[PDB]
Amino acid sequence: MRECISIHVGQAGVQIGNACWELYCLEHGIQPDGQMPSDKTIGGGDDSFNTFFSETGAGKHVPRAVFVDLEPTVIDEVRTGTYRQLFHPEQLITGKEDAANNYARGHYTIGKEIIDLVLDRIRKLADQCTGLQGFLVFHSFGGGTGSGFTSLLMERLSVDYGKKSKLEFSIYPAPQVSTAVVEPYNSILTTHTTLEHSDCAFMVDNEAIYDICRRNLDIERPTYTNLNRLISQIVSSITASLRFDGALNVDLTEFQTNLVPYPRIHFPLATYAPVISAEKAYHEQLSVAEITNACFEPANQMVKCDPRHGKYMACCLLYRGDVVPKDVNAAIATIKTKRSIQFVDWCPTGFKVGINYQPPTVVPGGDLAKVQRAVCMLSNTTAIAEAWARLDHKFDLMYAKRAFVHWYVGEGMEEGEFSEAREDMAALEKDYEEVGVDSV
Amino acid sequence: REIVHIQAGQCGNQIGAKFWEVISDEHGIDPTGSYHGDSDLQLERINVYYNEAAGNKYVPRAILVDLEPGTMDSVRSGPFGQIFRPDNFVFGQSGAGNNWAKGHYTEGAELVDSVLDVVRKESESCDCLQGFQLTHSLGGGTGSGMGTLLISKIREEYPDRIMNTFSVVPSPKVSDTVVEPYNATLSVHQLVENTDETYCIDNEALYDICFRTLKLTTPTYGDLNHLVSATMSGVTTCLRFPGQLNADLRKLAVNMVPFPRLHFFMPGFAPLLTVPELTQQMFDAKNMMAACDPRHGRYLTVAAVFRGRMSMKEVDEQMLNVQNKNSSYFVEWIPNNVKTAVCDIPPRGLKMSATFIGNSTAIQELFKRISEQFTAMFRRKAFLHWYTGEGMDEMEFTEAESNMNDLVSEYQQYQDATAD
Amino acid sequence: KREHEREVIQKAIEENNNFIKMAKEKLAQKMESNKENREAHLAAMLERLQEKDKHAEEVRKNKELKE
Numbered sequence A: 001m002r003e004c005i006s007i008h009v010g011q012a013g014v015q016i017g018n019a020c021w022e023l024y025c026l027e028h029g030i031q032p033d034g035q036m037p038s039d040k041t042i043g044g045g046d047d048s049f050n051t052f053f054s055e056t057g058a059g060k061h062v063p064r065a066v067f068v069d070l071e072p073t074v075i076d077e078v079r080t081g082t083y084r085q086l087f088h089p090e091q092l093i094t095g096k097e098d099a100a101n102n103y104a105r106g107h108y109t110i111g112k113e114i115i116d117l118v119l120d121r122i123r124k125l126a127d128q129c130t131g132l133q134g135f136l137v138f139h140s141f142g143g144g145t146g147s148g149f150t151s152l153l154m155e156r157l158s159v160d161y162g163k164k165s166k167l168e169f170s171i172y173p174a175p176q177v178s179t180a181v182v183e184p185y186n187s188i189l190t191t192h193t194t195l196e197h198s199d200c201a202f203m204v205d206n207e208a209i210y211d212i213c214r215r216n217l218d219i220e221r222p223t224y225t226n227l228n229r230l231i232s233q234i235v236s237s238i239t240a241s242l243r244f245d246g247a248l249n250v251d252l253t254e255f256q257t258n259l260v261p262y263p264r265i266h267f268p269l270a271t272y273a274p275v276i277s278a279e280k281a282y283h284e285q286l287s288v289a290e291i292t293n294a295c296f297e298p299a300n301q302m303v304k305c306d307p308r309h310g311k312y313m314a315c316c317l318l319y320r321g322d323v324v325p326k327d328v329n330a331a332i333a334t335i336k337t338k339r340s341i342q343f344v345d346w347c348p349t350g351f352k353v354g355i356n357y358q359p360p361t362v363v364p365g366g367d368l369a370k371v372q373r374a375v376c377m378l379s380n381t382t383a384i385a386e387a388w389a390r391l392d393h394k395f396d397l398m399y400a401k402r403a404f405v406h407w408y409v410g411e412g413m414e415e416g417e418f419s420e421a422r423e424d425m426a427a428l429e430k431d432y433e434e435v436g437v438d439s440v
Numbered sequence B: 001r002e003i004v005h006i007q008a009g010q011c012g013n014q015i016g017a018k019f020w021e022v023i024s025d026e027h028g029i030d031p032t033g034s035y036h037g038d039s040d041l042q043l044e045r046i047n048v049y050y051n052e053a054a055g056n057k058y059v060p061r062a063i064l065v066d067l068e069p070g071t072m073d074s075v076r077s078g079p080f081g082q083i084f085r086p087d088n089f090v091f092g093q094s095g096a097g098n099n100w101a102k103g104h105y106t107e108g109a110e111l112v113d114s115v116l117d118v119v120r121k122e123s124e125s126c127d128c129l130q131g132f133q134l135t136h137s138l139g140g141g142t143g144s145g146m147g148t149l150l151i152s153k154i155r156e157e158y159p160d161r162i163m164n165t166f167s168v169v170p171s172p173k174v175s176d177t178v179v180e181p182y183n184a185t186l187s188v189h190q191l192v193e194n195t196d197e198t199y200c201i202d203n204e205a206l207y208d209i210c211f212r213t214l215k216l217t218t219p220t221y222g223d224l225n226h227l228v229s230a231t232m233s234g235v236t237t238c239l240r241f242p243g244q245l246n247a248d249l250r251k252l253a254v255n256m257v258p259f260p261r262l263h264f265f266m267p268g269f270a271p272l273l274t275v276p277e278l279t280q281q282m283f284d285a286k287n288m289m290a291a292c293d294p295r296h297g298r299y300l301t302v303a304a305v306f307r308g309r310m311s312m313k314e315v316d317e318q319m320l321n322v323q324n325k326n327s328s329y330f331v332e333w334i335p336n337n338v339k340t341a342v343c344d345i346p347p348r349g350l351k352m353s354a355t356f357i358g359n360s361t362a363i364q365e366l367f368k369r370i371s372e373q374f375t376a377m378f379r380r381k382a383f384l385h386w387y388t389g390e391g392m393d394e395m396e397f398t399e400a401e402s403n404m405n406d407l408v409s410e411y412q413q414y415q416d417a418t419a420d
Numbered sequence C: 001k002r003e004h005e006r007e008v009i010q011k012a013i014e015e016n017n018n019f020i021k022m023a024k025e026k027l028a029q030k031m032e033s034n035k036e037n038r039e040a041h042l043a044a045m046l047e048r049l050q051e052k053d054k055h056a057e058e059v060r061k062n063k064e065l066k067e
């Protein structure tokens, strides 16, 4: 059992969903028609991949997933694209008119008209589970739908499924590919309203991904496709422990216990290696040591910040492929003797390690090399609060003049919601300060 | 999805027709309404501006309005005149004689209901109407007064749809008709309250461009309208061809309008090459379609649209360069206020082009000019009997003047604001 | 000890229910307040336009009673 349900919200969430499900199909040997010849138990089973896929009597393997957008053109591409047969039509839900980059339309004016249908389709998925574990929610911070509708949905899920865990994958805005001036408003509004409803959230900064694609894959001007394929490799590293078995495999829930010391402090920093082109991977085999070292190079982080000027509260290493513990231990010993790794005084310094043997996969025609071994580090560090600071400053500059605020008031919001949200962010920055001070 | 287009009065109808000619040419639609293009990119978002009729015929979603009949004849004989729906022509007999009060309160009020019937029939069959664009001048009688009446009535029936205008501002260099500053102030008073977006197309600037830069010693209306049609084509490019960007009129408005009253834009066009040259030229005062120096104010927001095949890396680098070297002209309290679009399909007869849309506080210079001419007459009450004879009070003139002065003062307030 | 065990499990049930209750009531208050504000915004706009139509009628009734 232990099933998980994925929810993909708005453009960014949908398109990242496409990249993730394509990659999962390649990892498990599922064809685009849904057939899986290696699966000899027809119509059911409790194999590890059944946490993410259900099975019909006709042998089709069907994602446990809902896609939601308030306009139709992005999800229409899924309806007509390569993987159109993977999904039942009731899983693909669209309205007619979007939120126009406005949190208030996604949470209230437009969002209210579709929330009950979305919840009922989710209920249909939940009823097929024999031991549902929780939810995975994919969305942008900056869009009207990804911010406001996601907020609304999280509130309703807490009502209908109680304390059942909810995890986020959240796209943090960058000016190089950003399309709206108001993205800082939406980011604070959704972060305030979701903070009590989420158990754990993985932020992905578009500027970090853009930089990595340019520097390591030699792509002059990266597209959404490049970014989403790399993101999907990180997501796959995180969920691999849920989707494959094995004796050195370590459950993600067990990492959550270690990653979250207080309910509000639930935002891990992800780092992935190696990201390398085919031309450079040739005749250059990367060892366990080289990739483990690369996990402490800030240029490989998913969020721009400097862990060397904060403190660690947890540090986890998720290996996949041709990796044995002996080489892990030698690499860790070296890193401990060489780098600036300072823990808070109320927390032990041991690194937690997992190994999955199933090797990494790449998509055909991609810009990533196929490699024999890879690693994802997840750290809980105070340095991540720098990203909140950057966003809060931009919020202040505009709000002092009330710029664009009339667009929100016209949909029924009050200024009090702006200032209440901003205060909650101020208190979060203060929490991150308090957890790094020494005991007395 | 669907946009409904309205053209009112002589000026509005002439530039409307040119707009429909240029975009019909860009989409490969002939005067009979048949598609004979070479590329699927031409039809993918065709329905934004065109209806499909039987026989795969494409008919503009366009309504044609005047109090003067005969402009209807000149349109109908124009090259694309057969393409328009015959029932969409709504024309009176009387004329308005350059009198705003006739357009807004008397002759135009009688006809407005028949105009609304056609509007409603077109709107009812839209899958998902985004809103409306109107072309008119502010200096005559029909387009200014009756057009702003139409705007008010549409807002009553579609209060949640976007209302956009392309509004031609008068200049003594093109028309000597003496009452024009009255008509423009009275219309602006309406526009501040009831539109989401107004492109200020200034006949002063168009004349100076035709004379100095294009070297036309005696500019005709045709030369001015060539510039207008190229600008309007540029500014609707991002809705009209498939291309990285997923937007509707409301999301554009949300990106461009930080305060509801400050929604009067300065358009530009280049050339009248390399990406640095286009970029330098589009930010030059001499390329603006409003007679304003942007270095006499600050930008609240800017959109830049490039057309043709070129390097996106290079476009990004040049936009950053202009911002870095001209940083004093962008208000510091709105981060990331410059947006860029690239369309692969060039306009007819050019390999590369740029269209500029600016929300600048320097637009106050335009409003000041008009204001000066207004006061010069109002202080002697010259020609006022033309308007009071239609039932108007002096008081309405006083209020309109006051509101335009307030708009100026507000632009100055945001020009002087700082961050610390 | 057995009675303490029963108090622990009852406290856990109670806290889960109280969290559900408070989130439901907070959501309902917000979704009502937003509806009221939006409808008031639209009603003020319509009322301003109707006052405009009234003024246009008084103007035409001025021009008729001039002659």
Ligand SMILES: Nc1nc2c(ncn2[C@@H]2O[C@H](COP(=O)(O)OP(=O)(O)OP(=O)(O)O)[C@@H](O)[C@H]2O)c(=O)[nH]1
Binding pocket: A009, A010, A011, A012, A013, A015, A016, A070, A098, A099, A100, A101, A102, A140, A142, A143, A144, A145, A146, A147, A171, A172, A173, A174, A177, A178, A179, A183, A206, A224, A227, A228
């Ligand atoms: N990484 C990544 N970011 C994306 C993608 N698509 C959009 N974004 C980012 O998401 C933000 C815009 O939000 P969208 O997802 O496009 O908006 P939306 O949820 O559809 O909301 P509305 O369209 O306003 O109703 C910008 O910061 C984009 O850079 C994507 O495919 N991948």
Ligand SMILES: Nc1nc2c(ncn2[C@@H]2O[C@H](COP(=O)(O)OP(=O)(O)OP(=O)(O)O)[C@@H](O)[C@H]2O)c(=O)[nH]1
Binding pocket: B008, B009, B010, B011, B012, B014, B015, B067, B068, B095, B096, B097, B098, B099, B137, B139, B140, B141, B142, B143, B144, B168, B170, B171, B174, B175, B180, B203, B206, B221, B222, B224, B225, B228
């Ligand atoms: N740029 C440009 N301006 C024009 C054109 N035609 C007229 N104008 C300007 O329009 C202003 C006069 O307004 P009109 O459009 O003629 O007035 P109208 O809407 O037709 O109303 P009436 O003629 O009184 O019935 C003058 O200032 C002209 O300079 C044109 O084709 N191009």
Ligand SMILES: Nc1nc(NCc2ccc3c(c2)OCO3)cc(-c2cccc3[nH]ccc23)n1
Binding pocket: A179, B133, B164, B197, B235, B236, B237, B238, B239, B240, B245, B247, B251, B252, B253, B255, B256, B303, B304, B339, B340, B341, B357
């Ligand atoms: N405000 C605004 N901007 C426009 N283009 C600039 C822009 C491009 C890409 C952007 C962006 C802004 O914001 C984020 O991405 C066009 C328009 C318009 C007006 C009237 C009629 C129209 N028919 C089609 C368009 C349009 N209106």
Ligand SMILES: [Ca+2]
Binding pocket: A039, A040, A041, A042, A043, A044, A045, A047, A055
């Ligand atoms: Ca099976």
Ligand SMILES: [Mg+2]
Binding pocket: A010, A011, A071, A098, A143, A145, B246
């Ligand atoms: Mg969208």
Ligand SMILES: [Mg+2]
Binding pocket: B009, B010, B066, B068, B071, B142
């Ligand atoms: Mg005329």
